Design goal:
binds sodium ion; peptidoglycan L,D-transpeptidase activity; Big_10; 351 residues; palmitate; elongated; 6% helix; 3 domains; mainly beta; 4-stranded antiparallel sheet; 3 helices; Immunoglobulin-like; 41% strand
Length: 351
């Protein structure tokens, strides 16, 4: 006749216990007759015992900077055993909150990366990547790449296949993200890839051609950046859209009062770079559209075409610019992810 045995997921006297997982107690050669866990203030922690009496677990989120006391008794035909354990959880120096894009339940285009933006610099990028679980259906290979010290992106080698489900579980609560900075909470999002929409602006023709699943559906005369402030070549991801917006160059590093500065209220504006490129309505340049470049970088189109673009293009669709006198959009722009070669993206930069 064996005495029951108790196995807890913490050890008496432990410090730095992480709260990324529940606390449990298991009985062998007996069943759990009593399990309680209280915090430093005497408040009971919610838990649940399995129907067979063998395993108890906490059922609510456990706190940072706690001292918990666990009491457990097991009974079997061979006798009884009781244990009391006290332990302390992680004490962060700092917290950081993740923000995930795109939005939960959204339908997005074939260029949309998964984005996890933290509100603090992440000292241990590898710990953050490890805590982020990305599910794809149909499953496709992808990889993480950091655009800056706070935001990481995940995407496949090529544009997504329409109809792919994407799930993002950012399981950062209880995780040490370096230098004592712990996740403030978990976050989650799920999204789906819709139709393939790729618009190409060719400086040789000054036409912006929109293709939906490979077919031309719209051909828009455009006026892009003038030679002294050109539109960069490259692949741009569609971001947010606005019925109207005041474009303020100081938002993009350029003082309004300086030679290339501007502040302009425009209609039907679709953002395609963090550096401030938009497709938008430009009634003042309709004469130049299809003929000469006049802007500070934006793709000027007619009011009707800008509204069409707003109505028919969605976040994650693609604009490709070719044959301008500019350089190439930086891969770390914020919407320039696809300009980074796959071998470099795949290798990452977690360090
Ligand atoms: Na993952
Ligand atoms: Na769609």
């Amino acid at each position: 006749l064996l005495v029951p045995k108790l196995t807890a997921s913490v050890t008496d006297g432990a410090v730095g216990v992480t709260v990324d997982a529940p606390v449990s107690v298991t009985a062998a050669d007996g069943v759990l007759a009593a399990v309680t866990m209280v915090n430093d203030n005497g408040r009971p922690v919610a838990g649940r015992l399995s129907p067979d009496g063998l395993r108890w677990s906490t059922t609510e989120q456990l706190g940072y900077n706690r001292r918990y006391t666990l009491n457990a008794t097991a009974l079997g035909l061979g006798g009884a055993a009781t244990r009391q354990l006290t332990f302390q959880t992680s004490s962060p120096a700092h917290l950081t909150m993740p923000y995930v894009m795109p939005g939960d339940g959204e339908v997005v285009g074939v260029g949309e990366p998964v984005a996890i933006r933290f509100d603090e610099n992440i000292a241990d990028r590898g710990a953050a990547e490890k805590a982020i679980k990305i599910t794809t259906n149909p499953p496709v290979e992808g990889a993480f790449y950091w655009l800056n010290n706070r935001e990481v992106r995940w995407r496949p080698e090529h544009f997504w296949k329409p109809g792919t489900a994407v799930d993002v579980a950012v399981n950062t609560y209880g995780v040490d993200l370096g230098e004592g900075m712990f996740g403030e909470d978990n976050v989650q999002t799920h999204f789906t890839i819709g139709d393939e929409v790729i618009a190409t602006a060719d400086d040789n023709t000054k036409i912006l051609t929109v293709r939906v699943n490979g077919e031309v559906v719209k051909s828009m005369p455009t006026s892009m950046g003038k030679d002294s402030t050109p539109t960069a070549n490259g692949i741009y991801i569609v971001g947010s859209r606005y019925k109207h917006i005041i474009m303020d160059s100081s938002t993009y590093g350029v003082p309004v009062n300086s030679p290339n500065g501007y502040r302009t209220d425009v209609d039907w504006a679709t953002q395609i770079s963090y550096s401030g490129v938009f497709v938008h309505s430009a009634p003042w340049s309709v004469g130049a559209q299809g003929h000469t470049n006049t802007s500070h970088g934006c793709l000027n189109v007619s009011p009707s075409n800008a509204q069409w673009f707003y109505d028919h293009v969605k976040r994650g669709d693609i604009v490709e610019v070719v044959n301008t006198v500019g350089g190439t959009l930086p891969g770390i722009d914020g919407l320039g992810d696809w300009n980074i070669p796959w071998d470099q993206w795949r290798a990452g930069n977690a360090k």
